[PDB]
Design a protein around this nucleic acid. Structure first.
Ligand code: K
Ligand code: K
Ligand code: K
Ligand code: K
Ligand code: K
Ligand code: K
Ligand code: K
Ligand code: MG
Ligand code: MG
Ligand code: MG
Ligand code: MG
Ligand code: MG
Ligand code: MG
Ligand code: MG
Ligand code: MG
Ligand code: MG
Ligand code: MG
Ligand code: MG
Ligand code: MG
Ligand code: MG
Ligand code: MG
Ligand code: MG
Ligand code: MG
Lengths: 184, 177, 243, 205, 132, 111
RNA sequence: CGCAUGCGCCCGCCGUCCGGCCGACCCGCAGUAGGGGCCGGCCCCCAAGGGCACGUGUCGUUGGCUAAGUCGCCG
RNA sequence: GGCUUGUGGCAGCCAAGCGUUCAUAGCGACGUUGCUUUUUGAUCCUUCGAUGUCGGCUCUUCCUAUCAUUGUGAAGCAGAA
RNA sequence: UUUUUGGUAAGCAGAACUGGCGAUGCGGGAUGAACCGGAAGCCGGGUUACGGUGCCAAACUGCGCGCUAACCUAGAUCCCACAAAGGGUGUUGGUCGAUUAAGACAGCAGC
């Protein structure tokens, strides 16, 4: 059962310069510029004027599922260049304090003393992502950037770098976890 | 012009006997590829539904039924019974076609595709021309639009005839919707 | 059925076939990766194995049993007189690997290197590179030589120098036919490599310009020959019972 | 597939975005009919099913080896040109003289080496991806597959192709300008040619 | 943004079969694969989209109109004149004309082309020496 | 202008010798399959039916002061749906002629 | 890349003589849910299904002249 | 060696019950579906103008239904095991 | 093939009717005594059977509809060279019932 036409629309803010050509969307705002390649989607992107219209013709239920995904990605780009994204992480430990060392212009972090281990864990932030230790809150990291995927993925790298092993993780709750998914 | 399946009215009765000099006359509307196969399927049902075998029966009339308006589009509903690999089932199907012959051809093709049901495992219970407002299947409803509009997403690239076919060409096909 | 007991196989299948090498001089199968940011420098050198002896030194290995103790360790003496650069060769990076583009030789070649080009040097007329050496004597010929060098600077991606040993200086070897090999030049741009190579034409490069003290090096050569040999000695399979 | 049947001294085929198997079968028939074929840009051939499936298939191929003497085959070529060559060999009776001669009329190259960089290159519609593969279905390039199975020249071909394309763009501009200079010439010649243009008018597109 | 759509009134070219080269009007749509087409010189019938090439011409008609209504709508929009005057429609006409040339006509065309080429080449040479 | 030296008029079309009439397991050399350049359908083959065919090849020795030899044939019937034809020659063509070219003349003429 | 045989060998010519062609003309790249050309509007595409070429003479008659143009050969 | 797989070996499904509580952490009664040819039988197709008939020694290669080693999920996994 | 006894079963053993092989090539089933077609003097032409028409390899990458996407070697033709119970919010059809513009469902808000 292929529906003849499935379409969804979104409103482009007033202070955003959106450029679309051959499923190559470029969004420019006060914070910077973001671009995503949507050539892998068999959809029809159109700017009508400002609004963005995405249509799928004679697409199966799987094909039409990408319509909302495309709009959400475009919406994230608009929010990235307007408000930005801010992910907050909290150190969790029972006995050994977790020591963090920001270096390289807030583009890198080193974790020491995780569960008393002498190994040093080094994580490099992705492009456009900066990590800063919060001062208002105790043992809190703040990651900021424009691309949600890069900021969120940077937080995931830190979280997975500090997994406890050979222990009951239910009791050994040590680690660095994302506590807030917000925007600047 | 040419149809795979033809609709026939077959009329028959049991042979007259001393007890019944005027036995009941039975009629059926059957689908078959030609008259000979229509008659054979008529006796199949009379044998199993009225207990009248061809050996003790009489064929009276056979006439082919043609679509009245073969130039307009109608919605056709088909009630059928079919045999799967594990039993028997009933289903209702809808089709859009200019003639009921085409709609029946689509039904057999669909049953073969979606259910692997061969022709001889299908019995047509009822057929009817459904008005647009009484259709049930969404595959038929979506084309009930006065402003029907869509592009040709998939095109078949080919020369008008094989006379203009060449193995090699200087440039790739130029396609746009 | 499965073998009764398990032991590792005898010998390595990574050194097959166990044939006589098709060469006497050790071939460099791979040169060090080139770092353009570093100065032009040679990557290989030829030497001759003189013999072995032992030395005593005081070890400085914190945490070791030998820390501040003396250890006796065997060493090998390799006599490495300076090599003479006699040419330059450039390679172009192609989809079929490196291809030799051109070879430019020096004007003057020693008798020792010229012997490498003959099977019977004394009986020959010794015509090698005589006509080639003449084009260094004319202005038009000199321009052609310089044009060939500029061609390497433009297309070559890998530059190697042709260098030979001064085998006459080691009378114990009893050999006058010198050994020639291509030594890759690493560091700098392609133009610097060509200028580096051409500047050494007919000059000597000491071993100290290539290696230094306390660094790790790789030694390439052909092992001692031993002729036809049985499986026990050749592969290390255990002997069968006496009976 | 009966064959093109055209009379040509040589046919140069650009294999970019051609399905490997369908291109192979057509070329195999052309070679068997006595046609000499040159295939360029074999690294851009497309294989349906995606990289993961095609990579797994090649790894199964790498398993096959004569246990007692691996040098006795099968030989597992890694370069795109050789993979295409071996694919065609499977569609030819290569163990007969007729088949061997047919294979000897085939040449395969990665990229577009000279002199074929200045020779017209044709395509084969029956093997084109745009006509044979539905948009959205998985496929991989033969060059990408070759790189992951031990072909280390992918970058070299990529740089040489970029250099060739830029030179071709410069040549294209020269012809583009020469065409603009020729439309003026015909307009000037229009006055001289009055009767001639009348005859050609019904035939001109 | 697509340029051509399947809709009531769209003029289509039959690109395959016996009816190749003829123009038809889509008067109704059966399903995704089939449409109801009608032309002044043919009976209304269904055909697959695989045999149709949509054009830029689109007349204003209602669904399944009468033949008289269809004919006047096409004449009001000059469907035939627009198609034949267009580059796409002229290509089909020229192909038929070239195939219909007899031996003598081909000889005349050869002379005209040869003379045309000779004069054009001379003009180019002047545009080379002068406008180098 | 080209300055070419060769035949000044061509009154024939080239045809490729594809093989013999055959099955998956048997071969019939008395009939040959010829592909005529430009003929892509069985209907187009009707024009060439009965047309004379010439298989010209070179021998090592000279006969009548020439190394050329000619075996004559003609188009008998179409083969398949894609314009291939069946041809008969005064003698069965040798397998060496597979992939070679033959001249398809325009005579005998019915037009 | 070096050196290459004096009654030999290698080249540039001229003849002698020997073992599949017939216009065998043609370099844009890229995309295909698009790409260009012109002034958001209007056009082009929708197969080289094109274009180019004395393409015209017994593989081509004799004797001249020959503007430019095209083509081959040659430093 | 081949067919077969009763027997031998290995695996799954249902969930009565066990598991302090708690069908399914770990187990699976009563039943039921399979796989394997490293057991033994059944058969007698090949070999009786002969295929050298136990085991060990030696040596290579292969399988996975994984004993240890690398990376992980689960627990009636605090740690250790 | 079918009926049929012993046996867990067997390319096992034993009967019933007919055909086949053995004694027989030939086309198809890649390959095969028995399966499908079909039985034959030596030849030319025509047409078929079974089986086929992307290449190997004679005949369509023919004209149509749908289904499938296999990160297990997806699957690919009587005999025939295997696969089961049991499962999947993979996807596609169908059957029965329930709810919904008097406002359902999700989320949000204070029934
Ligand atoms: K053993
Ligand atoms: K040893
Ligand atoms: K021993
Ligand atoms: K001429
Ligand atoms: K068993
Ligand atoms: K025996
Ligand atoms: K299902
Ligand atoms: Mg533990
Ligand atoms: Mg190596
Ligand atoms: Mg010795
Ligand atoms: Mg064929
Ligand atoms: Mg049990
Ligand atoms: Mg014996
Ligand atoms: Mg013996
Ligand atoms: Mg023996
Ligand atoms: Mg396992
Ligand atoms: Mg415990
Ligand atoms: Mg017996
Ligand atoms: Mg007997
Ligand atoms: Mg078989
Ligand atoms: Mg016959
Ligand atoms: Mg097909
Ligand atoms: Mg099941």
């Amino acid at each position: 059962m292929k529906t003849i036409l499935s379409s969804e629309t979104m409103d482009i803010p007033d202070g955003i310069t959106i450029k679309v050509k051959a499923k190559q969307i470029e969004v420019e705002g006060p914070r910077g510029k973001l671009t995503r390649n949507f050539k892998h989607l068999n959809l029809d992107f159109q700017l009508i004027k400002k609004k963005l219209k995405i249509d799928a013709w004679f697409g199966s239920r799987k094909t039409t599922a990408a319509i909302r995904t495309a709009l959400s990605h475009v919406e994230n780009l608009i929010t990235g260049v307007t408000k930005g994204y801010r992910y907050k992480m909290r150190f969790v430990y029972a006995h050994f304090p977790i020591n963090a060392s920001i270096s390289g212009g807030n583009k890198s972090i080193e974790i020491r003393n995780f569960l008393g281990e002498k190994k040093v864990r080094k994580v490099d932030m992705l492009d456009g992502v900066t990590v800063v230790r919060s001062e208002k809150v105790k043992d809190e990291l703040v990651l900021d950037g424009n691309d949600i995927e890069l900021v969120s993925r940077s937080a995931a790298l830190i979280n997975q770098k500090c997994h406890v092993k050979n222990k009951d993780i239910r009791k050994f709750l040590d680690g660095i976890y994302v506590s807030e998914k917000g925007r600047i | 012009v040419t149809y795979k399946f033809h609709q026939y009215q077959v009329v028959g009765r049991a042979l007259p006997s001393e007890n019944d000099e005027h036995p009941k006359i039975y009629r059926m509307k059957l689908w078959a590829t030609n008259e000979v196969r229509a008659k054979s399927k008529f006796w199949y049902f009379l044998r199993k539904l009225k207990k009248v075998k061809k050996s003790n029966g009489q064929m009276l009339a056979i006439n082919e039924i043609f679509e009245k308006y073969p130039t307009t589009i109608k919605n056709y509903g088909i009630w059928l019974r079919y045999q799967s690999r594990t039993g028997y089932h009933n289903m209702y199907k809808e089709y859009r076609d200019t003639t009921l012959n085409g709609a029946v051809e689509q039904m057999y093709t669909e049953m073969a595709s979606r259910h692997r049901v061969r022709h001889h495992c299908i019995q047509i219970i009822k057929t009817a021309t459904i008005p647009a407002k009484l259709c049930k299947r969404e595959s038929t409803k979506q084309f009930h639009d006065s402003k029907i509009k869509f592009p040709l997403v998939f095109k078949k690239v080919r020369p008008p005839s094989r006379k203009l076919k060449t193995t090699y060409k200087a440039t790739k096909p130029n396609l746009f919707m | 059925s499965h073998r009764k007991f398990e032991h590792p196989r005898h010998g390595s299948l990574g050194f097959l076939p166990r044939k006589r090498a098709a060469r006497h001089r050790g071939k460099v199968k791979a040169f060090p990766k080139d770092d353009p940011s570093k100065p032009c420098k040679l990557t290989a050198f030829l030497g001759y194995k003189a013999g072995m002896t032992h030395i005593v030194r005081e070890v400085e290995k914190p945490g070791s049993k030998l820390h501040k103790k003396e250890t006796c360790e065997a060493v090998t003496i390799v006599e490495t007189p300076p090599m003479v650069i006699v040419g330059v060769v450039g390679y172009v990076k192609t989809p079929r690997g490196l291809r030799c583009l051109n070879t430019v030789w020096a004007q003057h070649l020693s008798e020792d290197i010229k012997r490498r080009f003959y099977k019977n040097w004394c009986k020959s007329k010794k015509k090698a590179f005589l006509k080639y050496s003449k084009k260094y004597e004319t202005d038009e010929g000199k321009k052609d030589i310089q044009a060939q060098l500029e061609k390497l600077k433009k297309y070559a991606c890998v530059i190697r120098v042709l260098a030979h040993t001064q085998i006459r200086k080691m009378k114990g070897l009893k050999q006058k036919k010198a050994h020639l090999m291509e030594i890759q030049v690493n560091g700098g741009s392609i133009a610097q490599k060509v200028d580096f190579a051409y500047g050494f034409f007919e000059k000597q490069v000491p071993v100290d310009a290539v290696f230094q003290k306390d660094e790790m090096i790789d030694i390439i050569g052909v092992t001692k020959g031993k002729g036809y040999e049985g499986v026990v000695t050749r592969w290390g399979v255990t002997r069968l019972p006496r009976k | 597939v009966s064959g093109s049947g055209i009379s040509a001294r040589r046919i140069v085929v650009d294999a970019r975005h051609h399905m490997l198997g369908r291109l192979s079968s057509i070329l195999a028939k052309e070679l068997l009919n006595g046609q000499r074929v040159v295939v360029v840009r074999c690294e851009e051939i497309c294989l349906s099913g995606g990289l993961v499936r095609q990579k797994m298939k090649y790894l199964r191929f790498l398993r096959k080896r004569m246990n007692t003497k691996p040098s006795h085959g099968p030989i597992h070529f890694r370069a795109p040109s050789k993979i295409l060559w071996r694919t065609i060999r499977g569609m030819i009776p290569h163990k007969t003289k007729r088949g061997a001669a047919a294979l000897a009329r085939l040449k395969v190259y990665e990229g577009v080496p000279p002199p074929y960089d200045k020779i017209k290159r044709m395509v084969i519609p029956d093997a084109l991806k745009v006509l044979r593969l539905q948009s959205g279905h998985k496929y991989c390039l033969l060059g990408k597959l070759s790189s992951e199975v031990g072909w280390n020249h992918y970058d070299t071909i990529k740089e040489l192709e970029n250099k060739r394309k830029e030179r071709a763009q410069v040549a294209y501009e020269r012809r583009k300008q020469l065409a603009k200079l020729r439309v003026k010439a015909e307009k000037a010649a229009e006055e001289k040619l009055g009767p001639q243009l009348a005859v050609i008018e019904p035939i001109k597109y | 943004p697509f340029k051509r759509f399947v809709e009531i009134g769209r003029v289509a070219l039959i690109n395959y079969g016996k009816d190749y080269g003829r123009l038809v009007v889509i008067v109704d749509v059966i399903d995704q694969n089939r449409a109801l087409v009608d032309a002044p010189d043919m009976v209304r019938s269904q055909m697959n989209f695989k045999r149709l090439s949509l054009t830029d011409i689109k007349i204003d008609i209602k669904r399944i109109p009468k033949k008289k209504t269809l004919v006047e709508a096409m004449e009001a929009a000059d469907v035939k004149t627009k198609w034949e005057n267009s580059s796409w429609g002229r290509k089909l006409i020229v192909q038929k004309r070239r195939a219909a040339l007899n031996d003598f006509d081909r000889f005349k065309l050869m002379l005209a082309k040869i003379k045309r080429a000779g004069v054009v080449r001379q003009e180019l040479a002047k545009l080379k020496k002068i406008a180098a | 202008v080209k300055g070419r030296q060769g035949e000044r008029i061509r009154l024939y079309v080239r045809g490729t010798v594809l093989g013999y009439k055959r099955s998956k397991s048997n071969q019939y050399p008395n009939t040959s399959l010829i592909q005529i350049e430009g003929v892509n359908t069985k209907e187009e083959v009707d024009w060439y039916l009965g047309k004379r065919l010439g298989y010209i090849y070179k021998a090592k020795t000279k006969k009548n002061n020439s190394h050329y030899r000619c075996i004559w044939g003609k188009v008998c019937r179409p083969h398949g749906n894609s314009g291939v034809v069946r041809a008969k020659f005064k003698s069965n063509l040798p397998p060496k002629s597979m992939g070679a070219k033959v001249r398809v003349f325009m005579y005998p003429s019915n037009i």
